[PDB]
Amino acid sequence: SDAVTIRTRKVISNPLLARKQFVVDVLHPNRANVSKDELREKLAEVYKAEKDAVSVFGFRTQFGGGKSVGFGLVYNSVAEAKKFEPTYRLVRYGLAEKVEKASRQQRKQKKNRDKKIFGTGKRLAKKVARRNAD
Amino acid sequence: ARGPKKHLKRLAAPHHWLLDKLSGCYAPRPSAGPHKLRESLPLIVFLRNRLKYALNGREVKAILMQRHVKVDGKVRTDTTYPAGFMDVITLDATNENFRLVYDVKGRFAVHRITDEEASYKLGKVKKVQLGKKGVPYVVTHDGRTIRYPDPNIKVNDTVKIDLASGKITDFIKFDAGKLVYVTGGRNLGRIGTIVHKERHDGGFDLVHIKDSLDNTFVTRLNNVFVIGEQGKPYISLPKGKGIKLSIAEERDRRRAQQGL
Amino acid sequence: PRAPRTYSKTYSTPKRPYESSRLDAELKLAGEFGLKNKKEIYRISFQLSKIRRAARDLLTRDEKDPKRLFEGNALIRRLVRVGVLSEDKKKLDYVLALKVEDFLERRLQTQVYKLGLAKSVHHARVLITQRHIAVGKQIVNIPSFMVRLDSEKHIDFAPTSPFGGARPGRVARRNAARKAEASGE
Amino acid sequence: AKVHGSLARAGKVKSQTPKVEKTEKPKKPKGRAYKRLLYTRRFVNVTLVNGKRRMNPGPS
Amino acid sequence: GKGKPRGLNSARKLRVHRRNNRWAENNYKKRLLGTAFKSSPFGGSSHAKGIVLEKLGIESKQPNSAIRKCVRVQLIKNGKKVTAFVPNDGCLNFVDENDEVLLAGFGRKGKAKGDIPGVRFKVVKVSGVSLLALWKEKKEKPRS
Amino acid sequence: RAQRILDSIENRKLFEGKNGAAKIITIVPLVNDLDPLDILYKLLKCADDEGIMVQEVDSKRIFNVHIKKFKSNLKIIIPDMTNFLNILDCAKVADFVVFGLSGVQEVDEEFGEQIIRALELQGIASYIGVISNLSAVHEKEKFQLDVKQSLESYFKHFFPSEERVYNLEKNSDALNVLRTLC
RNA sequence: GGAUAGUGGCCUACCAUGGUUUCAACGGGUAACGGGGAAUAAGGGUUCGAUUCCGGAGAGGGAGCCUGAGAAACGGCUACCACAUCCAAGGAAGGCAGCAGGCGCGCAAAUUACCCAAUCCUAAUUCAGGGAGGUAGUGACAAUAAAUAACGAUACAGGGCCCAUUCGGGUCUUGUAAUUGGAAUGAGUACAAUGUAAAUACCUUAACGAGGAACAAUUGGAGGGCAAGUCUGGUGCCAGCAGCCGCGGUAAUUCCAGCUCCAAUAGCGUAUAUUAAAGUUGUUGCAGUUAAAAAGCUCGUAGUUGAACUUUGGGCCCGGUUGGCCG
């Protein structure tokens, strides 16, 4: 990089979520955008927690380059990071595994196929398997 | 139209909440509570929009459910719980206690109170009657009924309440020379030492008020809340002291004073 | 459905469309101040129309009145900070006497020419919309900028974007490499 | 008529012909520079006979 | 005393005189009689659309004596049969009988482009293919 | 409004049912390419039926295909590309003329355009445009659509009652083709 | 008295004869859901408001009802009417004016997409759910900003004019310069990164990307109104053209083209409606001898309007502002 010098401005110590939240001001002369992964090194090193205690997001770069402003998070423990932070961010940080639920309308069609059967329904498949098997 | 409303669209939110016009269609509708809807303030608006302790409403649920936070010594985990005027919001984050009180500008403020003052709230009597088995009881402005009051207390006085219990310590008679906090009305949040009162048998009994700069004004009696004797507040007034200004001296202060 | 985004158009079309004075008198402005459409004049007529309306209502009000003093002083002061109005004419009787060459004096397109190193007033505009010039820490690529008279001591070429440094660009790359280096095989 | 042509492609090789349509006059410089070219006609130079001018004259 | 009663409690007769005298303009009679919805074959619409019955030609007013080549449209939404003008020269060969023309008026609220005795609508689009563009040879007209 | 709806149904006794009904459809490739069998292949994937059993390599060229999903029965014709008069005498009977186009090879100036003009001057009942190349995507991951502007834009110049040219390489696009036929 | 959650002709019984009205009842019409608003901007108005918020009403048409705190609930039921679906013919089943789609209709309106990440809502509930809502697609409805080129050299004509010893070169600007040179770029593409629920896009940025036919701007006009052509040829009521006045029975200022010019400019043009212009709706503000208009005259109710007159002046301090040599 080229002398990034992250500034972490508007710091609020937030105990009831157990975190420090703040706005991340990133200079970056002569280079492009600054790539969250690199930031979570470069500010866990100054918040002295750990990489995976740190969440960072936003960062719309300034017009005509050279500055980017985003919003940051650093927790106390990585456990209490993982209990409060949204599940999509932990997917971004590797701290979770994206669970494969199906497509939305496909799930819905399964949901409306359950209103048409009362009970456990295994009796019904124990009925069709004799009434249409003869 | 078939029963009550569950929703409340933005644009129909009370304006002192200071929500944004964008970001979503709906605003939190306060649940039924101690306070009226229109002049309440929910906890969600109190946290994420005033204190900025949270960003999302989901974060607010995560705050309230872990219990962390309590109105009037009681935990109150509901998100749209309508906290209102002269209420004491207690957090365990660094022993912060908030008293919801109004401003010059007529908005609820972040007004931090010290913990000894966070014990008690005040409450305007709205009625005094006789309950079943002939028991007298007062009704404060926010629902708190109280059994067996001192019979000197009658309507439109105020009452200091313990909040460890429902016990009253002290009361203030509604009279001239007493400080008045104006809740509701055009003149919301001005503190000004009654001149006198008009009767108007038949409704809407006006009240004359004269603040510390002789800006005499009048509100209706329903927007009156006495908070003590002359210069003697029973609560911690916010920065402003009920000393609403011109627009002309706010360009004295707000761009002439703080500047270099 | 969420709140309607409010919006309002700027320019104001002229009422008589072929008027031999106006058609010619506008085009002198188009010449010296380097504007691409007559619309860019009309926008200035509209801004001036709102300052002349707001000033014209306040003159129906009296002196020592808080609305005229407040809204008046805010009007005037806002026009002083953009350098449209000069300094001695802080009266509000004068803000009716403004005209279009005072707003068009303060476009950044002309502030770069009048400032220096943009030789022309067309070369200045090309310097704007081609990302070269800046105001400060910020680059501006939009001509109609209204430089606010404190920022006059800050207009310069950008840190990036040559004329300002660190690179030659595209065309000097193709010359200095793909011709001058192309002499090497 | 026949449109498809080399508007199939966005653009790679449209019409590889250095054949003159006109002789450096097939194009008016449009937009901001066309009001440069009109300020330099309608105010820099040209008149017919005395001030009351025909701006599109009879060629003579 | 200049006709009308200027008395301070005489507002009623003012506004009732006025309501009697607004039925003097043409346009205010058009609005409140609902004439745009009863007569006037475009049923209160700018345009309409119709089937061409046949192609005609004119012998119009003096001095301009000629054959101006109008057509006969029957509208769809009414079943009314109204004559129609075809614009820029040629373009009678673009339409045929039993085609789908889109109509619009001339620009006078009806009557004429000029000498034309009783033709009020011009044709804008045949078969959806826009007579301006056909006349300038920018599209083509398929048959039907 | 009931007389008009009554005539609107009395129009549609002829085309509706498994009994007393048939549509006539012609698939014309405006390139030499494509071998328009596959147009019917792409277009009958969206029947979800056993009408893909007909259209084998067995050459029939007129198909009495019923579709279950729209209760319509079609007479799909493909004429030969050699006999030009077969093409002009096909759509001289037809009800729809589905035009193939190509992403790869341009529309033939001397043959394909003459097909569009000549059908277009003898009288077309109705007409639908189709892009059917896989190389509508396979050439172009270069923001794949833009050939759609060339073929819509090209395709309007003959008959501008057509807004868009349908792709048969996506699902509901092909479905709308099938609906519109049915 | 009944009935109602409750006042009440809400309903029954008995009794009385009242209640509204030209200060316009009642009846008819409304291409009439009502407001907050919108358009037009001297003032005063006129026209619109189905449509993001509030309030009402309806879920094919009427009626009835269950359950519940709350429904006369229709993504509840019952019947009838009108439609219409499967049927083995015995029966069974339904209401998109939710979302996306169709079909008709029309002058006139997009995707059978992605997701609960925001916004908020519901439940036994931080977790589940939500076509409420959001994201993308389509989208020239409307808005905002604004690319289609900037600069040099040489040479010819200048307008200046450098010091006016100027009779030195051109201080400095115009054109035509195919005479030339580099120099700067985005539209576009693209490794990446940010963006995002995941994506597309934007803001960033490696690599690549002007030279003219290129990375080619239209739409309207060129008699007057209304600014720009009688210039060059064609045509001779011959079609044309023309909102209005008209141009052309032939040396076309208007038709047809070619140049050239104008106006607006990623927009422009037409239809229809409406506002302005309109002091052609008139309260401000019209007109009535002769141009449209004074009723054939008088009485006369409602309406509208209606003479004057009833402690005035003088003292007397208090008493805030403005203005000042006083500063």
Side-chain angles (χ1 to χ4, degrees), chain A residues 98-115:
Chain A
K98 170 70 180 75
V99 50
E100 290 297 326
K101 65 178 62 175
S103 181
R104 181 190 184 68
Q105 71 183 20
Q106 191 191 356
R107 293 196 292 287
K108 282 213 200 58
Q109 290 174 8
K110 178 148 286 305
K111 180 189 85 69
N112 286 318
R113 283 193 287 276
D114 295 339
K115 288 168 73 160

PDB file of all heavy atoms in Angstrom, chain A residues 98-115:
ATOM      1  N   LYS A  98     -22.030 -20.576   5.297  1.00  0.00           N
ATOM      2  CA  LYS A  98     -23.326 -20.264   4.763  1.00  0.00           C
ATOM      3  C   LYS A  98     -24.128 -21.545   4.626  1.00  0.00           C
ATOM      4  O   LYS A  98     -23.777 -22.441   3.828  1.00  0.00           O
ATOM      5  CB  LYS A  98     -23.196 -19.535   3.423  1.00  0.00           C
ATOM      6  CG  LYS A  98     -24.519 -19.392   2.669  1.00  0.00           C
ATOM      7  CD  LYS A  98     -25.421 -18.414   3.388  1.00  0.00           C
ATOM      8  CE  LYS A  98     -26.751 -18.229   2.673  1.00  0.00           C
ATOM      9  NZ  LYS A  98     -27.652 -19.396   2.872  1.00  0.00           N
ATOM     10  N   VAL A  99     -25.205 -21.625   5.406  1.00  0.00           N
ATOM     11  CA  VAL A  99     -26.083 -22.791   5.378  1.00  0.00           C
ATOM     12  C   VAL A  99     -26.910 -22.765   4.097  1.00  0.00           C
ATOM     13  O   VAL A  99     -27.453 -21.717   3.729  1.00  0.00           O
ATOM     14  CB  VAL A  99     -26.939 -22.861   6.655  1.00  0.00           C
ATOM     15  CG1 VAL A  99     -27.640 -21.519   6.934  1.00  0.00           C
ATOM     16  CG2 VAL A  99     -27.892 -24.063   6.586  1.00  0.00           C
ATOM     17  N   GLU A 100     -26.963 -23.897   3.399  1.00  0.00           N
ATOM     18  CA  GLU A 100     -27.718 -23.952   2.157  1.00  0.00           C
ATOM     19  C   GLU A 100     -29.167 -24.273   2.415  1.00  0.00           C
ATOM     20  O   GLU A 100     -29.554 -25.428   2.407  1.00  0.00           O
ATOM     21  CB  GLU A 100     -27.123 -24.953   1.169  1.00  0.00           C
ATOM     22  CG  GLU A 100     -25.797 -24.501   0.590  1.00  0.00           C
ATOM     23  CD  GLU A 100     -25.893 -23.221  -0.227  1.00  0.00           C
ATOM     24  OE1 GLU A 100     -26.930 -22.991  -0.898  1.00  0.00           O
ATOM     25  OE2 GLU A 100     -24.907 -22.450  -0.180  1.00  0.00           O
ATOM     26  N   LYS A 101     -29.969 -23.247   2.656  1.00  0.00           N
ATOM     27  CA  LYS A 101     -31.428 -23.383   2.526  1.00  0.00           C
ATOM     28  C   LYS A 101     -31.749 -23.322   1.051  1.00  0.00           C
ATOM     29  O   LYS A 101     -30.940 -22.823   0.240  1.00  0.00           O
ATOM     30  CB  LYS A 101     -32.141 -22.277   3.280  1.00  0.00           C
ATOM     31  CG  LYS A 101     -31.885 -20.869   2.725  1.00  0.00           C
ATOM     32  CD  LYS A 101     -32.663 -19.813   3.489  1.00  0.00           C
ATOM     33  CE  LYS A 101     -32.274 -19.733   4.964  1.00  0.00           C
ATOM     34  NZ  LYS A 101     -32.976 -18.618   5.638  1.00  0.00           N
ATOM     35  N   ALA A 102     -32.935 -23.780   0.684  1.00  0.00           N
ATOM     36  CA  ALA A 102     -33.273 -23.831  -0.745  1.00  0.00           C
ATOM     37  C   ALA A 102     -33.625 -22.441  -1.280  1.00  0.00           C
ATOM     38  O   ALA A 102     -33.479 -21.427  -0.588  1.00  0.00           O
ATOM     39  CB  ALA A 102     -34.418 -24.795  -0.988  1.00  0.00           C
ATOM     40  N   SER A 103     -34.078 -22.388  -2.514  1.00  0.00           N
ATOM     41  CA  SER A 103     -34.655 -21.164  -3.013  1.00  0.00           C
ATOM     42  C   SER A 103     -35.954 -20.854  -2.293  1.00  0.00           C
ATOM     43  O   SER A 103     -36.624 -21.755  -1.791  1.00  0.00           O
ATOM     44  CB  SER A 103     -34.917 -21.250  -4.506  1.00  0.00           C
ATOM     45  OG  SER A 103     -35.456 -20.015  -4.955  1.00  0.00           O
ATOM     46  N   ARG A 104     -36.314 -19.578  -2.252  1.00  0.00           N
ATOM     47  CA  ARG A 104     -37.350 -19.113  -1.369  1.00  0.00           C
ATOM     48  C   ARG A 104     -38.673 -19.688  -1.834  1.00  0.00           C
ATOM     49  O   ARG A 104     -39.440 -20.253  -0.973  1.00  0.00           O
ATOM     50  CB  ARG A 104     -37.397 -17.593  -1.295  1.00  0.00           C
ATOM     51  CG  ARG A 104     -38.469 -17.091  -0.358  1.00  0.00           C
ATOM     52  CD  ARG A 104     -38.649 -15.598  -0.488  1.00  0.00           C
ATOM     53  NE  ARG A 104     -39.607 -15.065   0.461  1.00  0.00           N
ATOM     54  CZ  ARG A 104     -39.450 -14.990   1.802  1.00  0.00           C
ATOM     55  NH1 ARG A 104     -38.327 -15.339   2.492  1.00  0.00           N
ATOM     56  NH2 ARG A 104     -40.460 -14.524   2.505  1.00  0.00           N
ATOM     57  N   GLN A 105     -39.021 -19.491  -3.111  1.00  0.00           N
ATOM     58  CA  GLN A 105     -40.321 -19.945  -3.513  1.00  0.00           C
ATOM     59  C   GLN A 105     -40.429 -21.452  -3.526  1.00  0.00           C
ATOM     60  O   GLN A 105     -41.519 -22.020  -3.394  1.00  0.00           O
ATOM     61  CB  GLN A 105     -40.702 -19.332  -4.837  1.00  0.00           C
ATOM     62  CG  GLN A 105     -39.955 -19.837  -6.040  1.00  0.00           C
ATOM     63  CD  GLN A 105     -40.369 -19.078  -7.316  1.00  0.00           C
ATOM     64  OE1 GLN A 105     -40.915 -17.952  -7.250  1.00  0.00           O
ATOM     65  NE2 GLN A 105     -40.105 -19.687  -8.496  1.00  0.00           N
ATOM     66  N   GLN A 106     -39.293 -22.102  -3.686  1.00  0.00           N
ATOM     67  CA  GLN A 106     -39.255 -23.541  -3.573  1.00  0.00           C
ATOM     68  C   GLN A 106     -39.607 -24.008  -2.151  1.00  0.00           C
ATOM     69  O   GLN A 106     -40.319 -24.988  -1.993  1.00  0.00           O
ATOM     70  CB  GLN A 106     -37.895 -24.039  -3.995  1.00  0.00           C
ATOM     71  CG  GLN A 106     -37.867 -25.530  -4.150  1.00  0.00           C
ATOM     72  CD  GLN A 106     -36.450 -26.067  -4.306  1.00  0.00           C
ATOM     73  OE1 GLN A 106     -35.476 -25.311  -4.377  1.00  0.00           O
ATOM     74  NE2 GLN A 106     -36.333 -27.393  -4.364  1.00  0.00           N
ATOM     75  N   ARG A 107     -39.083 -23.346  -1.135  1.00  0.00           N
ATOM     76  CA  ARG A 107     -39.477 -23.651   0.239  1.00  0.00           C
ATOM     77  C   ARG A 107     -40.925 -23.400   0.442  1.00  0.00           C
ATOM     78  O   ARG A 107     -41.606 -24.121   1.190  1.00  0.00           O
ATOM     79  CB  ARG A 107     -38.750 -22.752   1.261  1.00  0.00           C
ATOM     80  CG  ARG A 107     -37.270 -22.983   1.365  1.00  0.00           C
ATOM     81  CD  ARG A 107     -36.836 -22.316   2.669  1.00  0.00           C
ATOM     82  NE  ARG A 107     -36.962 -20.876   2.591  1.00  0.00           N
ATOM     83  CZ  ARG A 107     -36.149 -20.070   1.892  1.00  0.00           C
ATOM     84  NH1 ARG A 107     -35.076 -20.509   1.188  1.00  0.00           N
ATOM     85  NH2 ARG A 107     -36.385 -18.753   1.917  1.00  0.00           N
ATOM     86  N   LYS A 108     -41.429 -22.331  -0.129  1.00  0.00           N
ATOM     87  CA  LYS A 108     -42.828 -22.038   0.051  1.00  0.00           C
ATOM     88  C   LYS A 108     -43.707 -23.092  -0.526  1.00  0.00           C
ATOM     89  O   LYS A 108     -44.801 -23.368   0.014  1.00  0.00           O
ATOM     90  CB  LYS A 108     -43.140 -20.683  -0.618  1.00  0.00           C
ATOM     91  CG  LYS A 108     -42.693 -19.493   0.244  1.00  0.00           C
ATOM     92  CD  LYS A 108     -43.720 -18.382  -0.040  1.00  0.00           C
ATOM     93  CE  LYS A 108     -43.200 -17.075   0.323  1.00  0.00           C
ATOM     94  NZ  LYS A 108     -41.929 -16.749  -0.418  1.00  0.00           N
ATOM     95  N   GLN A 109     -43.306 -23.660  -1.657  1.00  0.00           N
ATOM     96  CA  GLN A 109     -44.113 -24.713  -2.247  1.00  0.00           C
ATOM     97  C   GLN A 109     -44.100 -25.949  -1.383  1.00  0.00           C
ATOM     98  O   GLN A 109     -45.052 -26.729  -1.407  1.00  0.00           O
ATOM     99  CB  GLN A 109     -43.619 -25.018  -3.637  1.00  0.00           C
ATOM    100  CG  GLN A 109     -43.911 -23.898  -4.580  1.00  0.00           C
ATOM    101  CD  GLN A 109     -43.275 -24.188  -5.887  1.00  0.00           C
ATOM    102  OE1 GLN A 109     -42.753 -25.301  -6.114  1.00  0.00           O
ATOM    103  NE2 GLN A 109     -43.235 -23.171  -6.755  1.00  0.00           N
ATOM    104  N   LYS A 110     -43.032 -26.164  -0.633  1.00  0.00           N
ATOM    105  CA  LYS A 110     -43.050 -27.220   0.358  1.00  0.00           C
ATOM    106  C   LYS A 110     -43.973 -26.881   1.514  1.00  0.00           C
ATOM    107  O   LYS A 110     -44.634 -27.761   2.022  1.00  0.00           O
ATOM    108  CB  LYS A 110     -41.633 -27.500   0.837  1.00  0.00           C
ATOM    109  CG  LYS A 110     -41.483 -28.540   1.906  1.00  0.00           C
ATOM    110  CD  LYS A 110     -40.148 -29.262   1.743  1.00  0.00           C
ATOM    111  CE  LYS A 110     -40.126 -30.256   0.568  1.00  0.00           C
ATOM    112  NZ  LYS A 110     -41.215 -31.282   0.607  1.00  0.00           N
ATOM    113  N   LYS A 111     -44.042 -25.627   1.903  1.00  0.00           N
ATOM    114  CA  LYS A 111     -44.896 -25.244   2.983  1.00  0.00           C
ATOM    115  C   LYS A 111     -46.354 -25.415   2.598  1.00  0.00           C
ATOM    116  O   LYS A 111     -47.174 -25.859   3.440  1.00  0.00           O
ATOM    117  CB  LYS A 111     -44.704 -23.789   3.323  1.00  0.00           C
ATOM    118  CG  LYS A 111     -45.553 -23.263   4.442  1.00  0.00           C
ATOM    119  CD  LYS A 111     -45.368 -21.733   4.455  1.00  0.00           C
ATOM    120  CE  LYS A 111     -46.243 -20.927   3.518  1.00  0.00           C
ATOM    121  NZ  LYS A 111     -47.566 -21.042   4.044  1.00  0.00           N
ATOM    122  N   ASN A 112     -46.743 -25.107   1.356  1.00  0.00           N
ATOM    123  CA  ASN A 112     -48.123 -25.297   0.981  1.00  0.00           C
ATOM    124  C   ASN A 112     -48.452 -26.754   0.654  1.00  0.00           C
ATOM    125  O   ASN A 112     -49.619 -27.121   0.570  1.00  0.00           O
ATOM    126  CB  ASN A 112     -48.464 -24.424  -0.191  1.00  0.00           C
ATOM    127  CG  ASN A 112     -48.585 -22.986   0.213  1.00  0.00           C
ATOM    128  OD1 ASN A 112     -49.144 -22.737   1.239  1.00  0.00           O
ATOM    129  ND2 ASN A 112     -48.140 -22.031  -0.626  1.00  0.00           N
ATOM    130  N   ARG A 113     -47.445 -27.587   0.481  1.00  0.00           N
ATOM    131  CA  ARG A 113     -47.727 -29.010   0.391  1.00  0.00           C
ATOM    132  C   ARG A 113     -47.911 -29.675   1.731  1.00  0.00           C
ATOM    133  O   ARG A 113     -48.205 -30.851   1.769  1.00  0.00           O
ATOM    134  CB  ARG A 113     -46.620 -29.731  -0.359  1.00  0.00           C
ATOM    135  CG  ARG A 113     -46.698 -29.533  -1.849  1.00  0.00           C
ATOM    136  CD  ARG A 113     -45.746 -30.562  -2.432  1.00  0.00           C
ATOM    137  NE  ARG A 113     -44.363 -30.225  -2.227  1.00  0.00           N
ATOM    138  CZ  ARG A 113     -43.678 -29.409  -3.031  1.00  0.00           C
ATOM    139  NH1 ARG A 113     -44.247 -28.837  -4.103  1.00  0.00           N
ATOM    140  NH2 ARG A 113     -42.396 -29.138  -2.777  1.00  0.00           N
ATOM    141  N   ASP A 114     -47.706 -28.955   2.820  1.00  0.00           N
ATOM    142  CA  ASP A 114     -47.959 -29.519   4.122  1.00  0.00           C
ATOM    143  C   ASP A 114     -49.300 -29.158   4.673  1.00  0.00           C
ATOM    144  O   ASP A 114     -49.749 -29.810   5.627  1.00  0.00           O
ATOM    145  CB  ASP A 114     -46.886 -29.097   5.105  1.00  0.00           C
ATOM    146  CG  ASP A 114     -45.527 -29.650   4.720  1.00  0.00           C
ATOM    147  OD1 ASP A 114     -45.469 -30.665   3.961  1.00  0.00           O
ATOM    148  OD2 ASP A 114     -44.524 -29.053   5.165  1.00  0.00           O
ATOM    149  N   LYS A 115     -49.953 -28.158   4.129  1.00  0.00           N
ATOM    150  CA  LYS A 115     -51.279 -27.852   4.595  1.00  0.00           C
ATOM    151  C   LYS A 115     -52.281 -28.857   4.071  1.00  0.00           C
ATOM    152  O   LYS A 115     -53.398 -28.959   4.614  1.00  0.00           O
ATOM    153  CB  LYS A 115     -51.695 -26.456   4.163  1.00  0.00           C
ATOM    154  CG  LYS A 115     -50.971 -25.369   4.913  1.00  0.00           C
ATOM    155  CD  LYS A 115     -51.184 -24.022   4.262  1.00  0.00           C
ATOM    156  CE  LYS A 115     -52.557 -23.409   4.444  1.00  0.00           C
ATOM    157  NZ  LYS A 115     -52.527 -21.934   4.213  1.00  0.00           N
TER     158      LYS A 115
END
